[PDB]
Write an enzyme that holds these catalytic residues in place. Sequence first.
Site, PDB file in Angstrom:
ATOM      1  CG  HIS A 266      -2.054  -1.041   0.928  1.00  0.00           C
ATOM      2  ND1 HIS A 266      -2.042  -2.235   1.587  1.00  0.00           N
ATOM      3  CD2 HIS A 266      -3.125  -1.093   0.075  1.00  0.00           C
ATOM      4  CE1 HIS A 266      -3.093  -2.940   1.213  1.00  0.00           C
ATOM      5  NE2 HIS A 266      -3.774  -2.280   0.278  1.00  0.00           N
TER       6      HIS A 266
ATOM      7  CG  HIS B 170      -7.059   4.049  -3.812  1.00  0.00           C
ATOM      8  ND1 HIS B 170      -5.929   4.118  -4.592  1.00  0.00           N
ATOM      9  CD2 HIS B 170      -7.147   2.795  -3.323  1.00  0.00           C
ATOM     10  CE1 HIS B 170      -5.359   2.899  -4.609  1.00  0.00           C
ATOM     11  NE2 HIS B 170      -6.071   2.094  -3.811  1.00  0.00           N
TER      12      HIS B 170
HETATM   13  C1  LIG Z   1      -1.526  -9.541  -5.584  1.00  0.00           C
HETATM   14  O1  LIG Z   1      -2.424 -10.047  -4.571  1.00  0.00           O
HETATM   15  C2  LIG Z   1      -3.191  -9.148  -3.886  1.00  0.00           C
HETATM   16  C3  LIG Z   1      -3.282  -7.827  -4.147  1.00  0.00           C
HETATM   17  C4  LIG Z   1      -4.129  -6.984  -3.368  1.00  0.00           C
HETATM   18  C5  LIG Z   1      -4.875  -7.445  -2.307  1.00  0.00           C
HETATM   19  C6  LIG Z   1      -5.713  -6.568  -1.466  1.00  0.00           C
HETATM   20  C7  LIG Z   1      -5.589  -6.602  -0.063  1.00  0.00           C
HETATM   21  C8  LIG Z   1      -6.341  -5.757   0.739  1.00  0.00           C
HETATM   22  C9  LIG Z   1      -7.197  -4.829   0.137  1.00  0.00           C
HETATM   23  C10 LIG Z   1      -7.331  -4.787  -1.244  1.00  0.00           C
HETATM   24  C11 LIG Z   1      -6.611  -5.673  -2.046  1.00  0.00           C
HETATM   25  C12 LIG Z   1      -8.236  -3.645  -1.593  1.00  0.00           C
HETATM   26  O2  LIG Z   1      -8.640  -3.102  -0.309  1.00  0.00           O
HETATM   27  C13 LIG Z   1      -8.047  -3.781   0.712  1.00  0.00           C
HETATM   28  O3  LIG Z   1      -8.308  -3.540   1.850  1.00  0.00           O
HETATM   29  N1  LIG Z   1      -4.765  -8.827  -2.038  1.00  0.00           N
HETATM   30  N2  LIG Z   1      -5.395  -9.509  -1.029  1.00  0.00           N
HETATM   31  C14 LIG Z   1      -4.941 -10.738  -1.257  1.00  0.00           C
HETATM   32  C15 LIG Z   1      -5.320 -11.909  -0.415  1.00  0.00           C
HETATM   33  C16 LIG Z   1      -6.558 -11.668   0.457  1.00  0.00           C
HETATM   34  O4  LIG Z   1      -6.614 -11.856   1.642  1.00  0.00           O
HETATM   35  O5  LIG Z   1      -7.569 -11.217  -0.276  1.00  0.00           O
HETATM   36  C17 LIG Z   1      -8.830 -11.000   0.408  1.00  0.00           C
HETATM   37  C18 LIG Z   1      -8.937  -9.537   0.802  1.00  0.00           C
HETATM   38  C19 LIG Z   1      -9.030  -8.643  -0.429  1.00  0.00           C
HETATM   39  C20 LIG Z   1     -10.145  -9.323   1.705  1.00  0.00           C
HETATM   40  C21 LIG Z   1      -4.194 -12.746   0.206  1.00  0.00           C
HETATM   41  C22 LIG Z   1      -5.022 -13.339  -0.878  1.00  0.00           C
HETATM   42  N3  LIG Z   1      -4.042 -10.930  -2.330  1.00  0.00           N
HETATM   43  C23 LIG Z   1      -3.957  -9.675  -2.803  1.00  0.00           C
HETATM   44 MG   LIG Z   2      -7.509   0.870   0.446  1.00  0.00          MG
HETATM   45 ZN   LIG Z   3      -5.587   0.172  -3.000  1.00  0.00          ZN
END
Ligand SMILES: COc1ccc(-c2ccc3c(c2)COC3=O)n2nc(C3(C(=O)OCC(C)C)CC3)nc12
Ligand SMILES: [Mg+2]
Ligand SMILES: [Zn+2]
Lengths: 324, 334, 334, 324
Positions: free
Chosen positions: C83, C123
């Site tokens: 982030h 964002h």
């Molecule tokens: C390149 O891989 C990724 C990219 C981005 C994100 C991501 C994480 C958190 C947020 C977002 C996207 C948008 O807003 C959020 O709060 N995740 N998140 C996962 C996993 C996960 O836990 O996803 C479920 C989340 C989105 C609730 C482990 C698999 N992988 C990825």
């Molecule tokens: Mg966010």
């Molecule tokens: Zn984002």
Amino acid sequence: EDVLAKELEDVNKWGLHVFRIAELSGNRPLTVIMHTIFQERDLLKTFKIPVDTLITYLMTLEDHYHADVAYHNNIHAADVVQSTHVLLSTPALEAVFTDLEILAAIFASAIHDVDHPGVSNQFLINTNSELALMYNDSSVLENHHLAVGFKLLQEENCDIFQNLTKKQRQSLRKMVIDIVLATDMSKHMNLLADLKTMVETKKVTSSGVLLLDNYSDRIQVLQNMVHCADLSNPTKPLQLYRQWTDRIMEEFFRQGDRERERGMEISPMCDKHNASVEKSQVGFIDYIVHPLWETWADLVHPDAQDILDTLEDNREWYQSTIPQ
Amino acid sequence: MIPRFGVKTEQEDVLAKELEDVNKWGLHVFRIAELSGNRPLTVIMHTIFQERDLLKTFKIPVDTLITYLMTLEDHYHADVAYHNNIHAADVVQSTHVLLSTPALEAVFTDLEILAAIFASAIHDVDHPGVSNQFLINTNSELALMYNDSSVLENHHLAVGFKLLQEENCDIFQNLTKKQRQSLRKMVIDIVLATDMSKHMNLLADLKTMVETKKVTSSGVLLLDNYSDRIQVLQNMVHCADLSNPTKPLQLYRQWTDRIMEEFFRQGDRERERGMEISPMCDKHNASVEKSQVGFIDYIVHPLWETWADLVHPDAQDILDTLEDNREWYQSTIP
Amino acid sequence: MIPRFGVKTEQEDVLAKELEDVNKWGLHVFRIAELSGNRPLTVIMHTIFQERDLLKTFKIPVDTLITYLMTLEDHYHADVAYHNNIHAADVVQSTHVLLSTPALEAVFTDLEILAAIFASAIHDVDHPGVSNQFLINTNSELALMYNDSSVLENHHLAVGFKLLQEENCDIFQNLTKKQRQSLRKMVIDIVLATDMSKHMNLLADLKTMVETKKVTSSGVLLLDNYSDRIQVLQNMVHCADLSNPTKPLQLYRQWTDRIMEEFFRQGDRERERGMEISPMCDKHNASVEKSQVGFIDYIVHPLWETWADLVHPDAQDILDTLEDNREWYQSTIP
Amino acid sequence: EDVLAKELEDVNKWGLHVFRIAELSGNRPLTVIMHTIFQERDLLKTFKIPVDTLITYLMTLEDHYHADVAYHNNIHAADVVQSTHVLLSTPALEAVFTDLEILAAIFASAIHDVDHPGVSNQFLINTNSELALMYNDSSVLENHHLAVGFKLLQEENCDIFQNLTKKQRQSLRKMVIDIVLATDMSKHMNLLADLKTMVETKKVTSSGVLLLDNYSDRIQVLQNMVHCADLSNPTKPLQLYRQWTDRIMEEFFRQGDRERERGMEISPMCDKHNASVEKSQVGFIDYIVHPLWETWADLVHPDAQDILDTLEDNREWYQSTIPQ
Ligand SMILES: COc1ccc(-c2ccc3c(c2)COC3=O)n2nc(C3(C(=O)OCC(C)C)CC3)nc12
Ligand SMILES: [Mg+2]
Ligand SMILES: [Zn+2]
Ligand SMILES: COc1ccc(-c2ccc3c(c2)COC3=O)n2nc(C3(C(=O)OCC(C)C)CC3)nc12
Ligand SMILES: COc1ccc(-c2ccc3c(c2)COC3=O)n2nc(C3(C(=O)OCC(C)C)CC3)nc12
Ligand SMILES: COc1ccc(-c2ccc3c(c2)COC3=O)n2nc(C3(C(=O)OCC(C)C)CC3)nc12
Ligand SMILES: [Mg+2]
Ligand SMILES: [Mg+2]
Ligand SMILES: [Mg+2]
Ligand SMILES: [Zn+2]
Ligand SMILES: [Zn+2]
Ligand SMILES: [Zn+2]
């Protein structure tokens, strides 16, 4: 409205009927008195201040003084502004200060108590208030007055300094901060000692006005000027002074009622059950107000002689109404 | 001495051996930062709290202390080269050593000791790695809040106290109201004294105290009023903050690399923004070695000579190290 | 050295050549971040603003734009693995490509385009690299201010708008009050829709729109009310935020490496504090590959399949890449 | 003293003389009514709340309601607290809610308008106020009332929850946020839709009280309960209702006076020169208050019959005063 325009002709006089102006303006004394002074000093043209922007900012600023606070409200702010405007006009200071310095002193006066809650720094510290936490128990309210007065410039169409250069803005901001932080009564004895030192080493130009040839001396005079304006009530016509005394005692007695109900030690002069209003005014004059104004009067001699005479007449009136 | 009565890991034994030097000037604080997984402030503070028996004296729950320390450390910026958790740990441990100087034996109360070490721990928290003047010139929210006046020093205090409100972070929960009022006032007075704008007046007062210096029958300083007591604690923590050139050279060099990386990054930010580059922030027109010799001659040696007089002769080896390091840096000038 | 004089440096020319791909899915955003000296957000936003003629349209002074962009980029954390400013630059550039899709030709106003691109830029600003739940469970000041409700998404917006007040940062200074109120409402509606707690309702609304989908004279979407216009912009930016698995695998894997570093750091903080470790945050009990297949099957594919139906057939190649990457990750599972 | 004790005998009744209590308590209606309710419900013993801590927090909370605001003040807060206390006592809810849920509903009632400036969210948004910037123009004041009510627990001797367990604190905080955020009039239509669905599928226990067997249903009822209390004025005896209408119209007209002087569009029903006080009250009842209270009355049938009858009588009385 005719009657208002007429009261406002007294804007250059000590003893302006500020409570009448508050009534006649619909509780806009700070807005109308600031607008009148800005027009009189041609500050809108000098600093390219849009008139709508000035009025929007002044209404905003005034709205952030508390209507429920008996003393530290928009009428007090208007009074300090107008008193500073008269002290800036004193013959001993003619052409001494720049337009930016004048703007600083007047703006500093307008904001110097904004968002005052009607209780002391010590009350805010003792209660572990969020304000005291943010300001490390140090000039808590004075720091807050400044931050609010500047932050309100960011509201819609409120940036009265939008056409100043960065250099102008930086100098104006430093002078305003130096002035308002000096209104903390914790700084009174050191400010007064420095004013007395300047009186003992006083120099005048060939035009018979005060010589101030460095920032330290220039800002000391502006700090003491706005401090004198803040502490000017006992120097005003008695009818005005007595209204100010009623207001500060209402505010102090309300703080003492809050202290009492909370099981706190009641602050000096805040216990309505153990009060001597008239003796407290004589003490305020003897220990704080007369020492300051006698030194100011020596700095600008003889410009403030009628203000000092009024102070002495008013001291005798409170002395004469101390009960048995 | 860490007791051993069970087999332990490699990394653990090395960390424990380094922490045995916690009462010494010249602790290997970078090695402790590496060995603890970037928890130098947590492990050094906890060790000092144990060494001074502060958990027992102040009924600090150990879970609360560890949670607060990790929270505090987490609010130092990992991307800031100098004003980070390692600097905080170093100032805490330096203060801890200065409190132990023979000239101050039995002078300070447990609450004064707590104030000096807590003030040290929080004194640069949430430092962004730019100066007050940079925050003022950009019209930063922080500069607006604090009226351009000791902007970061005010902020470090507010943050260090605010973090006591996080979950299981109130290390002062068992202090009485009177202890909390006194602690708070002392901590504020100490941290606000770390603003370099205050250095010349602090040094003047320390000089006055040296000249009028009173000692007890025990040969230990006589401090019989708040103003003298707080002046010594303010100068003590300011000495700890300005202690890098008084350390063993391998430590001093790393502190110099770090402050210059931080200064040069600020200058790179000023350059890209079209601002005037701040003194010694221009990587294209810098003399790292000349600046250290100037720093020592005009700030660090005048302070440390005056401290050494107050506590004569306790600080002689510290002053000797400062004088040796100054000659090393001088000798590297082209 | 030879001073430079109105010609690009060689490093600037290499950056210009990489930025020729700014209108393509799969821009080398990490190489842009290196070549720009960690200014990917500033350089990509400046390129897109010039390409879409937004400075003339909105009377944005170029020095004000650059000052604000550097300021915004500076409030992304350099120590946060995912982030950060590279993620912001990627969402910006991804939104920019989605706005250009043939199905949306001439659909959105310049103000709506500005809202989507500004929303993308801000964002995640000042993201601390831990989840809302972490901030709630530690009783953080942010969670206190935002009542545990979209804590970070509220903060990103507040910071993105507050930085307009820094010196020479108000990029919207020449917009009318009417333009400012509309832009502000749209940006807030978009960023608050990036909270994953809103994902299912957003997707439910995008499906409803695909089912009741009307085109125009020229085979382009018809959106004739604010509710449908903002829904499409909200889903567009949410697809951009969730675009990493639709990119070429060399980019997608760099994103997976970064999110897992960030997640595992959060789990290490939870473990050391004695907290329950969040899902996918335990480095000792994680299946990166199973998690990506799960992320794709349950979150990313249902969103992108629905987006692809909305813009049929413009997103076929994006959807094919997503399905190929899902097959790749599935094939790496023991 | 004796007159106050006498009036506080009515604390379990709809139509308590809350203005009289405000006068007799020296403008401490919130403190005295909360203290009385905590004592009556045995909440100090249940949650080990030190009595000095409770009174210090109540006077601190009450102090953060604005004395210059005609409607959204400490008297409104006291009224919503007391109205929630009566609604919790309804036969249909006997033994339904836990002591922690009762504490959450009464605490949420007490804090739900704290630090209200007497102007609408839209006025704060349009002026680019610091609050609207912080809260992204989204439930600006409702977010602020919560933040303030929780922050004031951190003042000296204010932490009334200091003896709750961690799980009790986490549960209480989530319930309080859920309840206060539901006082936003932007949530009214979805809240009423869900209350209607609950009435359509209403179940009762073997003891004949409402069957609420999951958090979503339990919080739904507490949210609607405090929303009903907030919108209870037209359901009170007419002499109380007319005093509340006088207050909300003073507050609205002051906002319109500020809009007018600033050159802003005057908000609906804020123009003292183009007002329909009586038509506005009938519209408020017909479109908002009656649909809500008829549904609540269905949920707790027949406990709210007299409240609903009073509402319909007051609606006819105002209708009778609307000009042609
Ligand atoms: C390149 O891989 C990724 C990219 C981005 C994100 C991501 C994480 C958190 C947020 C977002 C996207 C948008 O807003 C959020 O709060 N995740 N998140 C996962 C996993 C996960 O836990 O996803 C479920 C989340 C989105 C609730 C482990 C698999 N992988 C990825
Ligand atoms: Mg966010
Ligand atoms: Zn984002
Ligand atoms: C019309 O009479 C008054 C007007 C104004 C003030 C006043 C009060 C507080 C502040 C200031 C002025 C300026 O900065 C402050 O913090 N006082 N204050 C007193 C007494 C008092 O207690 O004065 C001592 C204070 C100012 C240290 C009771 C006598 N009377 C008056
Ligand atoms: C190991 O060397 C250093 C360590 C620490 C510091 C330092 C920097 C800033 C602050 C402080 C110390 C305390 O409060 C501050 O605001 N400096 N600062 C310098 C130089 C400098 O410019 O000094 C400035 C003075 C006024 C601190 C380049 C020589 N070197 C060093
Ligand atoms: C004694 O009569 C009243 C009491 C209270 C309120 C009231 C005002 C605002 C809010 C609430 C209640 C709760 O949350 C709010 O934001 N109103 N509001 C109206 C009218 C109105 O404008 O109602 C529409 C509002 C509720 C959006 C004039 C008719 N009358 C009354
Ligand atoms: Mg003041
Ligand atoms: Mg510092
Ligand atoms: Mg409300
Ligand atoms: Zn004043
Ligand atoms: Zn430091
Ligand atoms: Zn209300």
